[PDB]
Every structure is written in C-alpha cells, then in structure tokens.
Design a protein around this ligand. Sequence first.
Ligand SMILES: Cc1cn([C@H]2CC[C@@H](COP(=O)(O)OP(=O)(O)OP(=O)(O)O)O2)c(=O)[nH]c1=O
Ligand SMILES: [Mg+2]
Ligand code: NA
Ligand code: NA
Ligand code: NA
Ligand code: NA
Length: 327
Amino acid sequence: ATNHNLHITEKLEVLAKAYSVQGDKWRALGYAKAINALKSFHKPVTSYQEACSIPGIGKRMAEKIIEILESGHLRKLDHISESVPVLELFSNIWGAGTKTAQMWYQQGFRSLEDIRSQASLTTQQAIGLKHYSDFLERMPREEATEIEQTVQKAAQAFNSGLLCVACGSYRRGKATCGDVDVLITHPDGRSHRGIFSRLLDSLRQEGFLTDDLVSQEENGQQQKYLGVCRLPGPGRRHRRLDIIVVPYSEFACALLYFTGSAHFNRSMRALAKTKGMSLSEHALSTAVVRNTHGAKVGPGRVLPTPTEKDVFRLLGLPYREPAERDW
DNA sequence: CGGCCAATACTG
DNA sequence: CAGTAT
DNA sequence: GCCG
Ligand SMILES: Cc1cn([C@H]2CC[C@@H](COP(=O)(O)OP(=O)(O)OP(=O)(O)O)O2)c(=O)[nH]c1=O
Ligand SMILES: [Mg+2]
Ligand code: NA
Ligand code: NA
Ligand code: NA
Ligand code: NA
C-alpha cells in the first residue's frame, strides 16, 4: 500500500538517520519501528490519542506527531548536530563506521577530499573511498545475474558438482541489487572444503576481482569473501561481491541467513530466542541456556534442518517465500 | 531498570 | 579486544 | 525511541 502520514514520517526519518549515524542504535531502532507503523496504517494520524494507540508509538513519539500537525514543523529537527551530514558522508565509506566517522570529524575533517589527503585509512577504507560513488549505487537485476553466473562458471570449472546460489536481495526477487551474494556448497558434504583458494585465484586470473575487502586465505577454514568485481566491456561499474562457502549439512540455515532480509533474520532469530532456541547461519539449536541479559550461556542441541521449511516448522512458523522476507 | 530487530566472521 | 561487516 |  502507501503511507498516509508522509508529512510525519518525513520529519521522523531525519531524526532516525541522525541518531543512527551517531551510534544511538536502539533510539534509532525506536524511530524505525514508529515510522514503519505510521505507514502500514490506514489513515492520517490527526489525534495525540490516535498516536498512542498505535503499537510502536508511545507518549514521546505521539507528542512529536502533534507538533508536525499543529505546527506543521518539528522544532527538534533544527537542534540536530551540524556534524550529522558529515558523519553520514564518512560512514558511507565501506569499512568506516560511526566510531571512525566521529574520530575523523573530531580531527577536523569535513569532506572526502580531507579524508583522501589527510586521514589515516585502513586498507578496506581506502578501497571503499576509491569506489565511493559506485558502492552507493544498486545494479540492475540482470547484472547481478551475470556476476552470479561468472562465479558459478568459475567454480563448476574445477568441480561440476558445486552448487552456487545467488542469495540476498537477488533471491528475494528485487529489481536492483546493492551487491551480489553467492552461496557455494556441495551435496557430497565435503568437496566444498578448501575451494576458496582455487575459486579466488581463478576469478583473479580473468581480472574479474579487482579488490579484496575481507578474505582470510591463510586459514583453510575460510568462511566468507567480501570483495569487489567488474564485468568486462564499456559502461561497467565496480560492484561489491559477497561469497560464502558452506558444508552441505548447513545448507538450509546458510541459505536462510544469506537470503535475509537482515531485518527478517533478526526477527526470526529473536523468535527462536523466546523459544529457548538459537538460530545462526550454521544451524538452529534448541535447549539453549541464556542469562538475564539475554546472552547465550549454554550451547544446546543442533536440530535437523534439511531444508528452509524445516527451520520455519521447528519454530512453529508458516513458511515464507524469499519474496515474503523482504523486510 | 533494561531488553529490543541476532548471531556470527575478519582485521589488526 | 573494538570496530565493522554479513 | 517503546514497553513491561
Ligand atoms: C547487513 C546484514 C545482512 N544479513 C544477511 C541477510 C541478507 C544477506 C546479504 O546481506 P546484504 O547486506 O547484501 O543484503 P541484501 O538484502 O542483499 O541487500 P542489498 O541488495 O545488497 O543492499 O546477509 C544479516 O543477517 N545481517 C546484517 O546485518
Ligand atoms: Mg546483497
Ligand atoms: Na502505542
Ligand atoms: Na561504512
Ligand atoms: Na587476506
Ligand atoms: Na552482501
């Protein structure tokens, strides 16, 4: 459907991103949920009482909405730190988060030019900066397909039995993808071991991969690869590539995890938590012991999960297609 | 007071 | 480990 | 931020 409180969610959205780039995770989550509510609603909130009546909206949020209605403007959006815009600019560099952005700001940096010429950058951050504009763009679904096929072909070259599945936003059927997430496994439950070394060198052979961000190749148990690639020919931009290699016994949970969305995964994992269970990309466990703070103290037993449906079932949830997980 | 939309993988 | 990432 |  559509949001009937746009004149409201617009002002709130500003604060949400403001608190988020400043590291106030939960308060930012608060506005997130409030904004999400005001949308899936049916009519324009006209009363303070009508606000409090919406789950996710309490006294505070409601008192905010009346000002956007009575004043047409929120006096809060004008007291937001002047650093926010710069912090957002900085944290959009792959490899730099709230802490680095805040440090750079305190050191007096205000633009990417300042970062380029004066800032201390990690190796990942330098790569992020070099592809600053490209990394903020989403590619057409068709391009994602080409990248995914490029990886599959390279993998099945030294083992036709290797199964390669494009997950993430691609599997959820989106029209555009931020990056390409590829899951690789093997039904024989063992031929997946030590394939990263070969796969990556192969992709570097053709010049497909242009930069590596996260890739522990000295360890034979390497689980993921986060990097950069670019297809051949003119008019091609550098795209982020995310690859995970998993044992067949973990295929179901890894597929579920890698498909997402991130919100969906967090919601599902939270659900499992309430049932004394734990869900990760490796497996769904039961009889998990946790303390008062909600932290895991006990391991638990790994439950049988041959397919994604099994996970939902064991959690008492009705199955949802990847497209129904686009939260 | 304090958990919430989690649980886990690299980097240095 | 803290930071950043998925 | 919300909510118990
Ligand atoms: C960031 C993040 C992601 N995940 C999962 C679930 C999705 C996949 C792929 O992540 P991606 O950001 O590419 O997401 P994607 O949905 O593919 O979106 P883009 O099109 O790449 O932006 O990983 C997660 O569990 N927790 C997180 O914090
Ligand atoms: Mg993705
Ligand atoms: Na409410
Ligand atoms: Na970043
Ligand atoms: Na490496
Ligand atoms: Na990704």
